[PDB]
Design a protein around this ligand. Structure first.
Ligand SMILES: *[C@@H]1O[C@H](CO)[C@@H](O[C@@H]2O[C@H](CO)[C@@H](O)[C@H](O)[C@H]2NC(C)=O)[C@H](O)[C@H]1NC(C)=O
Ligand SMILES: *[C@@H]1O[C@H](CO)[C@@H](O[C@@H]2O[C@H](CO)[C@@H](O)[C@H](O)[C@H]2NC(C)=O)[C@H](O)[C@H]1NC(C)=O
Lengths: 51, 51
């Protein structure tokens, strides 16, 4: 399936297929991102879908 | 008077009394501030009312 949270697929270890986290720094009056962690690359500044 | 845009007062040169500008950097998906210019100090990182 392809849901509202992107593609969903379960491999042989029952995780989701491609997890990724958006590193937020809280310094202003709003949560700004400062990059993105992915399973594939890890600590990118681009969106993790381009990799 | 004290309006919605703070205090308002006109000196002998017909300006407003204390002008100040919020330097915006446009790098994310939103305009973040990176400091504040004031007449009083000029290029502070604190709000210009504290000075
Ligand atoms: C998370 O990333 C890891 C590392 O790239 C991947 O898991 C490995 O994938 C390779 C190729 O598919 C396999 O040969 C390894 O045996 C895998 N290792 C482990 C520990 O699973 C995979 O791309 C991602 N895994 C998940 C569950 O998202
Ligand atoms: C903007 O800041 C300037 C500089 O601090 C000030 O203007 C001077 O103020 C002093 C003291 O009040 C006077 O002696 C000078 O004659 C002023 N100079 C000029 C060119 O006006 C003042 O604090 C602020 N002026 C305005 C219009 O906001």
């Amino acid at each position: 399936h392809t849901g509202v949270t992107g593609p969903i697929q379960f491999d042989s270890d029952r995780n989701r297929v491609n997890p990724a986290y958006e590193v937020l720094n809280l310094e202003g009056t709003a949560p700004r991102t400062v990059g993105y962690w992915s399973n594939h690359s890890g600590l990118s500044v681009v969106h993790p879908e381009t990799l």
